[PDB]
Design an enzyme around this catalytic site. Structure first.
Site, PDB file in Angstrom:
ATOM      1  N   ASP A   8      22.382  14.691  -7.803  1.00  0.00           N
ATOM      2  CA  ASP A   8      23.540  13.982  -7.548  1.00  0.00           C
ATOM      3  C   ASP A   8      23.621  13.964  -5.800  1.00  0.00           C
ATOM      4  OD1 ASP A   8      25.952  11.971  -7.497  1.00  0.00           O
ATOM      5  OD2 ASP A   8      26.816  13.915  -7.137  1.00  0.00           O
ATOM      6  N   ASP A  10      26.515  12.605  -3.492  1.00  0.00           N
ATOM      7  CA  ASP A  10      27.954  12.713  -3.185  1.00  0.00           C
ATOM      8  C   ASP A  10      28.732  14.112  -3.653  1.00  0.00           C
ATOM      9  OD1 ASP A  10      27.773  10.995  -1.162  1.00  0.00           O
ATOM     10  OD2 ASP A  10      28.550   9.269  -2.338  1.00  0.00           O
ATOM     11  N   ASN A 207      28.483  16.651  -9.785  1.00  0.00           N
ATOM     12  CA  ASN A 207      29.726  17.322  -9.558  1.00  0.00           C
ATOM     13  C   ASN A 207      30.842  16.379 -10.514  1.00  0.00           C
ATOM     14  OD1 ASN A 207      29.558  15.129  -7.562  1.00  0.00           O
ATOM     15  ND2 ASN A 207      31.410  15.741  -6.874  1.00  0.00           N
ATOM     16  N   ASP A 221      22.671  14.213 -21.387  1.00  0.00           N
ATOM     17  CA  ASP A 221      21.461  13.787 -21.896  1.00  0.00           C
ATOM     18  C   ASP A 221      20.488  14.694 -22.275  1.00  0.00           C
ATOM     19  OD1 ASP A 221      18.540  12.280 -21.958  1.00  0.00           O
ATOM     20  OD2 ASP A 221      19.856  10.799 -22.048  1.00  0.00           O
TER      21      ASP A 221
HETATM   22 MG   LIG Z   1      21.405  17.156 -20.508  1.00  0.00          MG
HETATM   23 MG   LIG Z   2      28.918  13.049  -6.950  1.00  0.00          MG
END
Ligand SMILES: [Mg+2]
Ligand SMILES: [Mg+2]
Ligand SMILES: O=c1[nH]cnc2c1ncn2[C@@H]1O[C@H](COP(=O)(O)O)[C@@H](O)[C@H]1O
Length: 245
Positions: A8, A10, A207, A221
């Site tokens: 990710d 941000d 986060n 997942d």
């Molecule tokens: Mg996973």
């Molecule tokens: Mg983030």
């Protein structure tokens, strides 16, 4: 021995909406000697590129760049063909949604309205009662009213009820807007393509991995090994622990 680390953006690699710290950026290239690296973010490509380098450097610095949750994909410098929301939802449901939103907003009286009340993106529609073409001051003014009157929250409640069972999801964050997207078009979307790239392991770092967060689904997942981080420094430390023990 083929590993992808997928991040990710941000609050995971950079301060929210800001440029990456050069020291973090340096570590990522170091990590690249042991694994392939990729980013996935809900923002459009331009915003992501902006945070992660100058110009289009991001697509040379990262093996994968998934913008708008993976509905836009760059793979080793090459742009793949995009998925459009209209092909998935169909014109009838898409227009039902659009007209509901137009009708609802027509009845809202705000201090100010501008334009771009419905922004058509690859991965979603962004709905803004004030309109996205507002100044910073106008945005803060709307935001304060929104908190008092629960403008976006009520709009989302009406939307969810109207389209119950029809496969639309609605973001819970934002300041002048909220997102409308198809079920499954959270960050997990990028996983379908990655499934075909013969990785032994895909490590995901985010986060917002608790329920409600925009990383929860991709984190949980079964195609990913999930990692919860609180800052880019935490992310670097975690990668050091796992990949440079
Ligand atoms: Mg996973
Ligand atoms: Mg983030
Ligand atoms: O729940 C959220 N989490 C993260 N980003 C969001 C969320 N909801 C909306 N956004 C995006 O955040 C950006 C900025 O939000 P704004 O302040 O409402 O313009 C927009 O491009 C939205 O698509």
């Amino acid at each position: 021995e083929r590993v992808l680390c997928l991040f990710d953006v941000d609050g995971t690699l950079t301060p929210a909406r800001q440029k990456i710290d050069p020291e973090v950026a340096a570590f990522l290239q170091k990590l690249r000697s042991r694994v392939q690296i990729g980013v996935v973010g809900g923002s459009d490509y331009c915003k992501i590129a902006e945070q992660l380098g100058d110009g289009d450097e991001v697509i040379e610095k990262f093996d994968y760049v998934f913008a708008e949750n993976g509905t836009v994909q760059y793979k080793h410098g090459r742009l793949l063909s995009k998925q459009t929301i209209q092909n998935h939802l169909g014109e009838e449901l898409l227009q039902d949604l659009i007209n509901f939103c137009l009708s609802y907003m027509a009845l809202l009286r705000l201090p100010k309205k501008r334009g771009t009340f419905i922004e058509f993106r690859n991965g979603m529609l962004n709905i803004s009662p004030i309109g996205r073409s507002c100044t910073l001051e106008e945005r803060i003014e709307f935001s304060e009213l929104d908190k008092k009157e629960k403008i976006r929250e009520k709009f989302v409640e009406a939307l969810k009820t109207e389209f119950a069972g029809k496969g639309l999801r609605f973001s819970r964050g934002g300041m002048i807007s909220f997102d409308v997207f198809p079920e499954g078009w959270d960050k997990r979307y990028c996983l379908d393509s990655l499934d075909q790239d013969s990785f032994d392991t895909i490590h995901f770092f985010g986060n917002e991995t608790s329920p409600g967060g925009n990383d929860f689904e991709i984190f949980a997942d079964p195609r990913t090994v999930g990692h919860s981080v609180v800052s880019p420094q935490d992310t670097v430390q975690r990668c050091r622990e796992i990949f440079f023990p």
